[PDB]
């Protein structure tokens, strides 16, 4: 027995209260509008014209305000998110700057100068939805359970997906189609993205960069950098017997070509280099700040760069001859990208554009002036900034050629189908690779990721790993500086690389220090370095988000402080024991001693993927060994948000887990606290949502017990007459009549109407009365005397909702009556009439439709078991066992073994025991409740102990030989009803380009007959039907051509021969005639030769 | 004939729009209005 603290389950809620799931999406933006927005202002700080050096403007301070709207005339009132969501407006706040400009001779300092607007997040620091109370949240008509984190642009909720990319400022050594090759990608803050690569062929190293014409020898690059004597070159490379046999050839081919001085190498390079000022200076400045710009050069010293290239060559040599290769599947190198730095790049590019083009606005006015003073605030504009921001957010085209980048599909509309689909989309992560079949590694589950990305959470289909979700406990590190870090490392006793030569780095005892892909120097006895750095980090002086690791195969220590790293807290242990005790957590339960002081007391700490590489972590407290360094808080935090709804995930199989986590976001239910006020395009709601009996701790963490998307129902696992085939399930007619599974659909119909540049307008006449009696006509029946439909009415098929009459171009008006198209008979809920930002009237209507479950509706079991309903059985059937309880949904026992789902029976047992006793049973992953204490509790009541009951068949009236498995199960209703998945067409509209059925059901189109279905008709050998349903029913056309010269005539007449003597006709599909008429314009004339079918 | 009665969403005051007027409220500064329920007789099924 070992002392075990059963209290560490309350650390996780206190940790999520600080940050975590979605609070980091707001942290990245709150830090960006407080730190980087002024860094960009300081970057572009002074700009002046060149006409005469007397005019200039200066940037003092910049800041943003609160969400405000500019109405008719100087009307700035605080607007709420719901108002912007209903008025199709955009949630944004202005950016007021305090700049100074010199006009004439004196200087003018105009305070509070507006330059544009910028969108603000829903739960950010500048918004009104922060620090409020639920009573006040109900005052602004907003759900308090809304996590937020999206953008409202033109009345839609847009969220920016997190995108993962590879690490920059690092060396990779990977193998390709022939051999091994090293590469280096360089990209700092300033826009300079470079990709250099060193390759090996014929025992000769060659350096490739897109600025050079062809290969340049590495020894030539060395001699050009400044290292002249060939001895210290090999000294820097490596002093070993096997590294010289591979470096001799290059040295001797270098001696072959007559290059022995720096000027010779520089002239050689300049002659090699092509670019569209002499050759020596060209080659000098090209080796200075073009190839590797992440290694700064003070005056003109290429020593750090040449030692960097030498250690790169040494890594390539040690990779050469072995099977040690670097892969891109490691997640310790992969970095994440939020919406903060994207907005940063967008804003800095827009600001640079606005500063550089306005520099040209006052550059054509100074010589061609009219007075002595020039005002610049009247030569100022505030539409490009707002336009660019809104366009980049809504459109989704991140195109920055100043940054040399084009990205599509970054922002997406927030899924508002259910409460899980909304939160689960915020943790969705996108990859940099495109959706292709070639990938198998990155799609495969990597052993590197542990507790950072949910393994089960992934969509099944085409993308099978390109889309991943975050874990419950993880944190994204923001960027820092490295001043104090380098200072403390220099004080610890690290050596300057500029003093010692190349020979000492080949020493095994010597270790190299790397900081964000930068060589700081040489350190001996790296263990003391790592220990002291870790102790200083645990102290509190250095920030906690600084990684340190050591690698012995290449003998280098890495110090990582870049932003975008994954961090999760771990409990520290000291030589046999966790530092956290019972007295430390009793205070946390009391109300003091929270997470931040726990970190300040050196009891827990963050570790990254690369830092946990050199650490031992214990799963539980009974497996703690003498080399374990950290202790994982809880093992059930590995599962994600969508995987936390599955009872007993370890009992279930991974395909079923994936199916269920994918179907959890499609399950329909309640949306939030304000679903009657919000008017979305499509909304699915339930009538009476029940509460899951067997709930999970993750359910309580997210508070899913307030917005459930399912219902509890009695299930009987047994075969029925004939309608529980592979996935079919049987319903109870009496239960369906009582109201089990009642659904509601809400559709939106919005119409905007505006004015024009002339005095033309739009108008709504309204209803039409006849001459016999005073009744509205059948066309306009629901319309009110105003001209719109009144709520609380019933609209049938092809009836007018609103009359819209607009002029053709006194003027003639064409009426465009909006007509409702639907197979069902809809109902009107409410009507909203408002105005938008551009002075146009907007009329919105919400249409309600109540539906009941029928044969052809898809249901799930919340265990990866989906099926359409089979036969609807009345209550005379569906046998009761003893008390008179009938099966609500009949389940088939034949789909259990193949699917291999054992958690379903355990969940049923736990739910039955709970509904009998009267308390909810915990079913969390890697724990919960067992099947030993629950079955003995099912005996006290009087039922059987595991699952069995005596049933009496109803259709015959005889008992059942074998026993049946009865119990309550949490079922959920999904989308894709048979009411919408039902189409039929005989003769409808056709396209103008080709006479063929159009695409889609919204335009009443047909079905497509592809080649794979044509192959089935060909393999049979039927020719009449193959021609009947491709030419007779699709497009039958009668064309005419001539016998003298094969050409398409008209009206039995040719324009080439100008004679109707040789004229005949035939039957051809319109597609073939169109192809002929298209090819005749390509200098390809299909001269046809007719004949009699008798011939 | 009878002025079209409309209700607001902040004060819920039943006002009327005369003809081509700025769509607002005479009590508050809210710019969105709602509509009343029809005074006809609609039949429903209790099945």
């Amino acid at each position: 027995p070992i002392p075990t603290v059963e209290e560490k389950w309350r650390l996780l809620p206190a940790f999520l209260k600080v940050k975590g799931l979605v609070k980091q999406h707001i942290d990245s933006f709150n830090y960006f509008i407080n730190v980087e927005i002024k860094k960009i202002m300081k970057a572009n700080e002074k700009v002046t014209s060149d006409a005469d050096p007397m005019w200039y403007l200066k940037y003092l301070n910049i800041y943003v305000g609160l969400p405000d709207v500019e109405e008719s005339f100087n009307v700035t009132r605080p607007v709420s998110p719901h108002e912007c969501r209903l008025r199709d407006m955009t949630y944004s706040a202005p950016i007021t700057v305090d700049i100074e400009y010199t006009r004439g001779s004196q200087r003018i300092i105009r305070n509070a100068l507006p330059i544009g607007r910028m969108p603000i997040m829903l739960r950010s620091s500048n918004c009104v939805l922060t620090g409020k109370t639920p009573a006040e949240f109900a005052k602004l008509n907003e759900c308090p359970l809304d996590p937020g984190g999206y953008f409202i642009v033109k009345g839609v909720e847009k969220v920016i997906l997190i995108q993962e990319q590879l690490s920059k400022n690092r060396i990779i050594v990977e193998a390709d189609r022939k051999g091994a090759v090293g590469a280096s990608v360089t990209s700092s803050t300033h826009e300079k993205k470079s990709r250099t690569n060193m390759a090996v062929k014929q025992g000769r190293f060659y350096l490739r960069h897109n600025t050079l014409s062809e290969d340049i020898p590495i020894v030539i690059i060395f001699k050009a950098m400044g290292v002249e004597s060939d001895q210290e070159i090999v000294q820097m490379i490596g002093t070993e017997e096997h590294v010289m046999a591979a470096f001799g050839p290059s040295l001797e081919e270098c001696q072959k070509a007559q290059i022995f001085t720096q000027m010779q190498a520089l002239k050689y390079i300049g002659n090699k280099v092509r670019r569209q000022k002499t050759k020596i200076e060209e080659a000098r400045e090209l080796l200075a700040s073009t190839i590797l710009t992440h290694v700064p050069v003070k005056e003109f010293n290429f020593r750090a760069k040449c030692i960097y290239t030498a250690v790169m060559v040494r890594r390539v040599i040690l990779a050469q001859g072995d099977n040690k290769v670097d892969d891109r599947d490691y997640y310790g190198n992969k970095r994440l990208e939020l919406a903060g730095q994207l907005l940063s790049l967008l804003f800095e590019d827009l600001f640079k554009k606005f500063n550089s083009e306005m520099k040209k606005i006052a550059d054509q006015v100074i010589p061609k002036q009219r007075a002595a003073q020039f005002d610049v605030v009247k030569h100022m504009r505030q539409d490009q900034i707002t336009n660019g921001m809104v366009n980049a957010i809504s459109t989704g085209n991140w195109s920055l050629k100043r940054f040399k980048m084009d990205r599509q599909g970054v922002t997406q509309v927030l899924s508002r189908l259910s409460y899980i689909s909304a939160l689960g989309m915020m943790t969705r992560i996108s990859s940099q690779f495109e959706k292709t079949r070639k990938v198998s590694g990155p799609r495969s589950l990597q052993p590197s990721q542990w507790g950072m990305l949910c393994p089960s959470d992934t969509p099944e289909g085409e993308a099978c790993g390109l889309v991943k979700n975050l874990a419950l406990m993880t944190h994204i590190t923001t960027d820092m500086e490295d001043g104090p870090i380098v200072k403390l490392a220099s004080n610890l006793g690290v050596e300057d690389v500029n003093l010692l030569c190349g020979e000492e780095l080949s020493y095994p005892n010597v270790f190299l220090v790397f900081l964000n892909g930068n060589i700081l120097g040489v350190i001996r006895d790296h263990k003391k370095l790592v220990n002291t750095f870790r102790l200083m980090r645990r102290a509190g002086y250095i920030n906690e988000f600084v990684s340190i690791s050591t690698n012995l195969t290449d003998r280098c220590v890495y110090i990582s402080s870049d932003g975008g790293r994954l961090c999760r807290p771990y409990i520290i242990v000291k030589k046999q024991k966790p530092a956290v005790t019972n007295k430390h957590m009793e205070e946390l339960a009391q109300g003091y001693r929270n997470f931040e002081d726990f970190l300040h007391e050196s009891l827990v700490e963050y570790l990254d993927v690369n830092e946990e590489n050199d650490c031992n972590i214990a799963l539980y407290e009974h497996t703690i060994n003498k080399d374990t360094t950290h202790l994982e808080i809880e093992p059930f935090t590995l599962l994600g948000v969508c995987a936390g709804l599955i009872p007993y995930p370890h009992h279930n199989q991974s395909p079923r887990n994936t199916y269920q986590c994918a179907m959890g976001k499609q399950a329909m239910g309640t949306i939030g606290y304000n679903q009657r006020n919000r008017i979305d395009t499509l909304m699915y709601l339930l009538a009476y949502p029940q509460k899951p009996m067997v709930k999970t701790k993750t359910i309580e963490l997210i508070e899913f017990e307030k917005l459930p998307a399912g219902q509890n129902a009695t299930v009987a696992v047994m075969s029925y007459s004939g309608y529980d085939i592979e996935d079919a399930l049987v319903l109870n007619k009496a239960s369906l009549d009582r109201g089990f599974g009642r659904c509601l659909v809400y559709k939106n119909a919005k119409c905007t109407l505006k004015r024009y540049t002339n005095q033309t307008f739009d108008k709504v006449m309204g209803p039409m009365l006849d001459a016999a009696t005073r009744k509205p006509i059948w066309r306009h029946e629901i319309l009110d005397a105003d001209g719109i439909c009144s709520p609380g009415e019933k609209v049938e098929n092809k009836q007018v909702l609103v009359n819209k009459s607009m002029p053709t171009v006194q003027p003639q008006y064409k009426d465009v009556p909006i007509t409702y198209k639907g197979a069902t008979d809809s109902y009107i809920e409410k009507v909203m009439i408002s105005s938008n930002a551009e002075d146009a009237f907007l009329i919105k209507m919400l249409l309600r439709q109540t539906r009941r479950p029928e044969i052809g509706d898809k249901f799930s079991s919340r265990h990866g078991q989906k099926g359409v309903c089979g036969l609807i059985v009345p209550q005379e059937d569906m046998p009761f066992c003893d008390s008179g309880i009938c099966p609500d949904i009949i389940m088939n026992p034949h789909g259990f073994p193949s699917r291999m789902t054992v958690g379903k029976l355990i969940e049923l047992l736990a739910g039955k025991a709970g509904v009998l006793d009267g308390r909810f049973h915990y079913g969390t992953a890697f724990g919960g409740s067992k099947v030993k204490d629950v079955c003995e509790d099912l005996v006290r009541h009087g039922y059987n102990y595991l699952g069995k009951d005596y049933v009496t068949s109803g259709i015959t009236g005889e008992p059942l030989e074998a026993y049946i498995y009865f119990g309550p199960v949490y079922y959920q209703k999904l989308k894709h009803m048979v009411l919408d998945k039902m189409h039929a067409r005989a003769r409808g509209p056709r396209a103008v380009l080709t006479r063929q059925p159009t695409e889609g059901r919204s335009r009443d189109g047909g079905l497509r007959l592809g080649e794979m279905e044509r192959d089935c008709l060909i393999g049979y050998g039927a020719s009449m039907l193959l021609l009947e349903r491709l030419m007779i029913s699709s497009d039958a056309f009668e064309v005419d051509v001539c016998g003298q010269c094969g050409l398409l005539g008209y009206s039995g007449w040719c324009h080439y021969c100008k004679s109707s003597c040789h004229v005949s006709s035939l039957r051809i599909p319109y597609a073939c005639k169109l192809l002929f008429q298209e090819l005749q314009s390509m200098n390809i004339i299909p001269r046809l030769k007719l004949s009699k079918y008798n011939e | 004939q009878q002025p079209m009665i409309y209700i607001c969403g902040e004060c819920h005051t039943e006002n009327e729009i005369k003809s081509r007027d700025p769509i607002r409220c005479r009590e508050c500064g809210y710019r969105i209005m709602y509509k009343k329920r029809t005074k006809r007789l609609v039949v429903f099924d209790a099945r």
Binding site: R755, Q759, T760, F761, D762, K763, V764, M765, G766, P767, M768, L769, D770, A771, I777, A785, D786, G787, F841 | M4, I17, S19, R20
Partner: peptide, 10 residues
């Protein structure tokens, strides 16, 4: 420029 509250008779 708008016009509402109309009834057309046939």
């Amino acid at each position: 420029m708008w016009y509402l509250k109309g009834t057309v008779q046939s």
